[PDB]
């Protein structure tokens, strides 16, 4: 994920040279931060600072769709994950959890979380995953129903002094 766009790299054991190919977009200069890959590896879904999730097939450099319609997340795509069914869970910079089915990009359920999202970790069987904010807050987010629950909260940064 180059700041300009998506690149696909080819490494071959025969020669040390690396082959670089660029994914092209028609009159699109959105900047890309995060990326995730289909388990089938046919497509890769990449975030954007604007708030929409683009999806590009690996085989062709063309992009198939824009992303969420009529709605943007207002601070970019912090974290991105995929369920086995293909539903994509996306975290916004302002603090927001939403899931998109592989259909028209419309959210099945939406919820908000305190602080900027920084980590999403799916558990085995892909249920009830863990979330980590930018404000040092640990949250636990259920699947198919986005209800934020705080397990433990941590200090933000630079404790200066303690009193009793």
């Amino acid at each position: 994920v180059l700041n300009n766009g998506v690149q696909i790299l080819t490494i071959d054991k025969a020669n040390k040279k690396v082959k670089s190919l660029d994914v092209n977009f028609g009159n699109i200069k959105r900047q890309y931060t995060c990326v995730a890959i289909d388990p089938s590896d046919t497509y890769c879904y990449c975030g954007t600072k604007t708030g929409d999730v683009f999806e590009i097939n690996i085989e062709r450099a063309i992009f198939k769709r824009l992303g969420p319609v009529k709605k943007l997340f207002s601070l970019g795509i912090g974290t991105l994950g995929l369920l086995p069914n293909g539903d994509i869970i996306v975290g916004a910079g302002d603090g927001t959890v939403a899931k998109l089915s592989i259909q028209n990009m419309q959210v099945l359920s939406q919820s908000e979380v305190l602080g900027a999202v920084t980590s999403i970790s799916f558990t085995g069987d892909y249920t009830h995953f863990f979330c980590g904010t930018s404000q040092s807050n640990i949250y636990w987010i259920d699947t198919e129903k986005l209800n934020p629950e705080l397990r433990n909260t941590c200090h933000y940064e630079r404790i200066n002094d303690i009193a009793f």
Binding site: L83, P84, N85, G86, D87, S101, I102, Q103, Y126, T127, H128, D142, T143, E144, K145
Partner: protein, 53 residues
């Protein structure tokens, strides 16, 4: 086109306990048992605003 795989999508909140075949509403004639709600035909909206082709 694309469509999510419908067998793999999963519901987490609902629990997996199964009521089984054995049950019994006979002898349970309390006044607070729920009653079936019949289907109702929707409001007919007709076509006063559809396109005329």
């Amino acid at each position: 086109q694309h469509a999510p795989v419908f067998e793999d999508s999963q519901a987490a909140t609902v629990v997996n306990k199964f009521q089984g075949l054995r049950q019994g509403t006979g002898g349970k004639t309390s006044t607070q048992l729920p009653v079936k709600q019949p289907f109702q035909a929707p409001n007919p909206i007709c076509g006063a605003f559809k396109k005329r082709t």
